[PDB]
Amino acid sequence: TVGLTDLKVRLVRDDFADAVAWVARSLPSRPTVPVLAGVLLTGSDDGLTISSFDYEVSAEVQIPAEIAAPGTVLVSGRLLSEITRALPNKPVDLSVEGTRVSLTCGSARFSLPTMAVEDYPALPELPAETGSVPADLFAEAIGQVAVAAGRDDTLPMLTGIRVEISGDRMVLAATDRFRLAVRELTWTTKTPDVEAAVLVPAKTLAEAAKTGLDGSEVQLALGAGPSVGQDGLLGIRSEGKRSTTRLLDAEFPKFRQLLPTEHTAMATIGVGELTEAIKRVALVADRGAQVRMEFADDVLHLSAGADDVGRAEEDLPVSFSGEPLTIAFNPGYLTDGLGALHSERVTFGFTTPSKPAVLRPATEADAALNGNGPFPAAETDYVYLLMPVRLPG
Amino acid sequence: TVGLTDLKVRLVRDDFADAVAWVARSLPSRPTVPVLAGVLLTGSDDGLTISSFDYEVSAEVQIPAEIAAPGTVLVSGRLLSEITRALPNKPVDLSVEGTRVSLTCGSARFSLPTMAVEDYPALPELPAETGSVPADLFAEAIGQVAVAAGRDDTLPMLTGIRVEISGDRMVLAATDRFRLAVRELTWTTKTPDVEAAVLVPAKTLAEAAKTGLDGSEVQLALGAGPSVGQDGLLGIRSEGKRSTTRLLDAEFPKFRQLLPTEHTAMATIGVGELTEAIKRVALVADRGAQVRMEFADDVLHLSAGADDVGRAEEDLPVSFSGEPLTIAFNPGYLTDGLGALHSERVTFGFTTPSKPAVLRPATEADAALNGNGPFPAAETDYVYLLMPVRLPG
């Protein structure tokens, strides 16, 4: 709450820099309201609360700090971040001089102008906790799904990652219209028979996955009972670094219907070698490119390029089964999926050279797979559905 | 010379990739004549000559290669570079199919279109050798001087580095109008009493310093006797990688006159600590910045910034001597010089807070320097003359 006192605090660099860092990354890029570019520093009760709010993304962290006089100060976020990033490891003194915010440290001294906290907005209080998730695994999931998230703000449906809860099983899924990534993940709920679904901004969720899921556990807050998701914001708290994200109004397109049941052809090949081959063959093509995969008798004839700029073709061995095939994909999307599998060997589920193709981690179940087909699809944890492209004609 | 035969050659990746690399970096960025974007591959006498010419920069290298049929082929330089950069370590087959240039390697095969070598220009034959220089030391010099080279093609005088020869002593010097870097370097001449001076494009010379002076010695070819420099081009050969650079018509401004004789004040301080302090204090200022250095009683009060965006100040110890001082410089240029010294301790020669300041490596001769002054200037190997800036008023 507002403090009539002028702040006066002592901190340690490491803590202050880490906090100002994680809070600075969550800042926007100088938006309409200049005040939003500022960072809030609320010193009280032996702790310094560093906060930032974007009317969409909230970031807050508290630090142990020897308080000499409480207070609240708003200061340029980017400038604070750079300075703190350049401070020596010596402890940091921080006082207020009316309209200035003196920051002393060793032999260096800084004097930043105080931004009008009077105009600064509030900081949304996070919703009621809904459950807990493992950090590294959760971040891995967000990373695997966000790969196929739409990055055009003119199509909000794709701009987000759908987070679904159903007991101790949640489902993350995003799509860019051509690629559709899905990932099941088991967690812990505080509402036993909770079932809900929400669309989170992919950029912000991925942003938190890179720098927020730093602890051993990550708390997810959406609500309680019938109010799960009703709050309209998603809270994420880990290691005292708690952040908020306003949800997307648009609803996610029905995606489960798009997942094939049976696969006409199936291929299994090493991720690394395939990726290298795809990049190699792609270098010939220009920006607008196309990787052609001709599956025949456990051999993949990976061709591409045109007769004007040049054409490339590389032959690789493959554990193939089913009817032969000649299917074309986008090199970028294909590389994206292969890189998101986080597996040592990839399995492709092909239906039609014009219908979508499944990319999922290989399983020893698929190793014992030979016949004419069709073949049932496996229930892998992560699946990447890529829409192929047209062939020369 | 033109070969009626269609080329057919076998090489090893490492050699071919290194050659195509060094020759590709010397290429322009798709200039007026598309043919210039191509790379020349002349296979003859057990060797493949990879060449490229920009009507200004020439790059040529020869590789050992099993020739099955000689020939000459022109192919897209960037495409060749990327492909060769992505080839496996297996040997590389290279044949010509009329209008195509098939390149086989292991399981991968490429087919690039042949560019019209009929329109390709000649490759300037290098001038008569003038002498030899140590590689690492020569590159170090070019790097130390090029730091202060003008990068605006609308002022050719600054666009180059002046290379002067006088026996076994050469002098490299460049200037950007505000910073003026000079470097003396001893080499070996083939024309005993040779004396000449030339202006080389700084971008191209630095380009060669990063990737051309790779051997133990670097040969410099300008001419012989009175024809030294008359050729109009500079040849540089090392480890069979020989390159040419067309000289600049504009003449270098008289710079020796600008070097002060006596210094009113002198400072000696560690490079690292000073650099850190300058960057720290600079973060407060915006793009258009200014580092203020107040030298007083072996203490440097390094302040900067304005009362609107903020102001910083850091106090450092210094081995100072002479009249006190308060001088301002540009943070970028100052950092550039300090980084170009390649020394552990820097010595500043100050004359007037408005006149240029000298930055040169510190010497134990300066360690025994105390008095009112003036002080004579030392004849260091490298000197960086920085023009200060105006103070608030």
DSSP string, A302-361: EEEEETTTEEEEEEEE-EEESS-EEEEE-HHHHHHHHHHS-SSEEEEEE--TTS-EEEEE
Q: How many CB atoms lie within 10 A of CB A34?
A: 12
| Region at B282 (left for phi over 0; alpha for psi -120 to 50; beta for the rest) | alpha
Burial class of B280 by CB neighbour count within 10 A (0 to 12, 13 to 18, 19+): buried
**Nearby residues of B217 by Cβ (< 8 Å), 6 or more positions away:** B132, B133, B134, B135, B238
Cα separation, B375 vs B265, in Å, equals 8
Residue A256: C-alpha distances to residues A341, A355, A377, B251 (Å): 19, 15, 13, 72
Q: Hey, is A162 helix, strand or coil? A: strand
Cα separation, A128 vs A109, in Å, equals 42
Residue B348: C-alpha distances to residues A231, B148, B176, B317, B337 (Å): 63, 17, 20, 14, 11
Does A113 contact chain B (CB < 8 Å)? yes
Buried-state track B235-266, b at ≥16 Cβ within 10 A, e below 16 = bbbbeebbbbbbbbeeebeebeeeebeebbbb
Q: How many CB atoms lie within 10 A of CB B320?
A: 21
Token pair of A218 as six digits:
């990550």
Which residues is A47 bridged to in the sheet? A44, A64
Using CA atoms of A180, A181, A187, A189 in order, give the dihedral in degrees to the nearest 10: -20
Q: How many CB atoms lie within 10 A of CB A310?
A: 23
Residue B333: enclosing H or E segment and its boundaries? helix B331-340
Q: Which residues of A touch B82 (CB under 8 A)?
A: 283
Cα separation, B111 vs B101, in Å, equals 5
Tell me how many residue pairs between chain A and chain B have CB atoms under 8 A apart: 76
Cα separation, B146 vs B320, in Å, equals 29
Does B83 contact chain A (CB < 8 Å)? yes
Beta carbons of A283 and B83 less than 8 Å apart: yes
**Of B283, B308, B315, which is closest to A83 when you measure between CB atoms?**
B283
Cα separation, A342 vs B104, in Å, equals 32
Q: Which residues of B touch A113 (CB under 8 A)?
A: 308-310
**Is residue A80 within 8 Å of A11, Cβ to Cβ?**
no
Measured in angstroms, the resolution is: 3.2
Cα separation, B235 vs B219, in Å, equals 8
Residue B135: C-alpha distances to residues A136, A289, B142 (Å): 49, 43, 11
* Top-tier CATH class for A257-386: alpha beta
**Is residue A52 within 8 Å of A42, Cβ to Cβ?**
no
Cα separation, B141 vs A134, in Å, equals 54
Token pair of B179 as six digits:
């910073």
**Is residue B255 within 8 Å of B358, Cβ to Cβ?**
no
- Edge-to-edge strand ranges of the sheet holding A100-105: A66-69, A8-11, A92-95, A100-105, A108-113, B310-317, B299-306, B291-296, B325-329
Q: What are phi and psi of B379, to 5 degrees?
A: -100, 60
Which residues is B50 bridged to in the sheet? B41, B61
Beta carbons of B284 and A83 less than 8 Å apart: yes
**Nearby residues of B68 by Cβ (< 8 Å), 6 or more positions away:** B8, B9, B10
% helix / strand / coil in chain B, to the nearest 5?
20, 40, 35
Buried-state track A254-267, b at ≥16 Cβ within 10 A, e below 16 = ebeeeebeebbbbb
Closest CA to B241 of B50, B46, B42, B27: B50
Distance from the B387 Cα atom to the nearest Cα atom in chain A, whole angstroms: 26
Identify the residue whose tokens are 């009060």.
B301
Q: Which residues of B touch A115 (CB under 8 A)?
A: none
Max Cα distance, chain A (Å): 80
DSSP state of A177: S
Q: Hey, is B77 helix, strand or coil? A: helix
Identify the residue whose tokens are 């089913």.
A322
**Nearby residues of B393 by Cβ (< 8 Å), 6 or more positions away:** none
Closest CA to A52 of A83, A29, A69: A29
Closest CA to B83 of A339, A333, A311: A311
Cα separation, A31 vs A312, in Å, equals 46
CA atoms within 13 A on the CB side of B76: 16
Q: Hey, is A194 helix, strand or coil? A: coil
Superfamily of domain B129-256: DNA Polymerase III, subunit A, domain 2 (3.10.150.10)
CA atoms within 13 A on the CB side of A339: 14
Dihedral sign for Cα A183, A184, A186, A187, please.
Answer: positive
DSSP string, B120-178: ----PPP--EEEEEEHHHHHHHHHHHHTT----TT-TTTSEEEEEEETTEEEEEEE-SS
Closest CA to A298 of A281, A273, A315, A276: A315
Buried-state track A44-65, b at ≥16 Cβ within 10 A, e below 16 = beebbbbbbbbeebbbbbbbeb
Cα separation, A338 vs A326, in Å, equals 19
**Of B107, B283, B305, which is closest to A86 when you measure between CB atoms?**
B283
Beta carbons of A313 and B109 less than 8 Å apart: yes
Cα separation, B194 vs B190, in Å, equals 8
DSSP string, B299-315: EEEEEEEETTTEEEEEE
Does A309 contact chain B (CB < 8 Å)? yes
Cα separation, A172 vs A99, in Å, equals 47
Q: What are phi and psi of A16, to 5 degrees?
A: -60, -40
Cα separation, B130 vs A106, in Å, equals 55
Q: Kind of pairing, strands B8-11 and B66-69?
A: antiparallel
Beta carbons of B86 and A279 less than 8 Å apart: yes
Cα separation, A75 vs A115, in Å, equals 5
Cα separation, A174 vs A157, in Å, equals 9
Superfamily of domain B8-119: DNA Polymerase III, subunit A, domain 2 (3.10.150.10)
Token pair of B225 as six digits:
């006797």
DSSP string, B226-290: GGTTTTSEEEEEETTEEEEEEPPSSPPPP-GGGS-SEESEEEEEEHHHHHHHHHHHHHHS-SS--
Identify the residue whose tokens are 């007037």.
B352
Q: Which experiment gave this structure?
A: X-ray
DSSP state of A281: H
Token pair of A174 as six digits:
């995003």
How many residues does this entry show for chain B?
A: 393
Compute chain B's Rg from CA coordinates. Answer: 25
Q: How many CB atoms lie within 10 A of CB B13?
A: 17
Beta carbons of A315 and B107 less than 8 Å apart: yes
* Per-residue H/E/C for B256-274: HHHCCCEECEEEEEEHHHH
Cα separation, B381 vs B393, in Å, equals 38
Mutate to test the interface with B, among A280, A291, A308, A309 (most CBs of B within 10 A): A280
Beta carbons of A111 and B312 less than 8 Å apart: yes
Q: How many CB atoms lie within 10 A of CB B279?
A: 14
Cα separation, B386 vs B379, in Å, equals 17
Cα separation, A69 vs B274, in Å, equals 34
% helix / strand / coil in chain A, to the nearest 5?
20, 40, 35
Which ranges in chain A are annotated with CATH 3.10.150.10?
8-119, 129-256, 257-386
Residue of B nearest to A87 (CA): B280
Token pair of A75 as six digits:
């200061």
Beta carbons of B313 and A109 less than 8 Å apart: yes
Q: What are phi and psi of A166, to 5 degrees?
A: -150, 85
DSSP state of B30: S
DSSP state of A69: E
| Region at B35 (left for phi over 0; alpha for psi -120 to 50; beta for the rest) | alpha
Closest CA to B280 of A41, A84, A103: A84
Q: Which residues of B touch A311 (CB under 8 A)?
A: 110-111
Q: Hey, is A14 helix, strand or coil? A: helix
Compute chain A's Rg from CA coordinates. Answer: 25
Q: What are phi and psi of B340, to 5 degrees?
A: -85, -15
- Going through A210-252 in order, the beta strands assigned E by DSSP cover 217-221, 233-238, 241-246
Q: Which residues of B touch A82 (CB under 8 A)?
A: 283
Closest CA to B217 of B249, B260, B183, B188: B188
How many residues does this entry show for chain A?
A: 393
Does A355 contact chain B (CB < 8 Å)? no
Q: Which residues of A touch B281 (CB under 8 A)?
A: 108
Does A112 contact chain B (CB < 8 Å)? yes
Cα separation, A53 vs A43, in Å, equals 17
Using CA atoms of A145, A146, A147, A149 in order, give the dihedral in degrees to the nearest 10: 110
Buried-state track A98-137, b at ≥16 Cβ within 10 A, e below 16 = eebbebbbebbbbbbebbebeebeebbebbebbbbbbbee
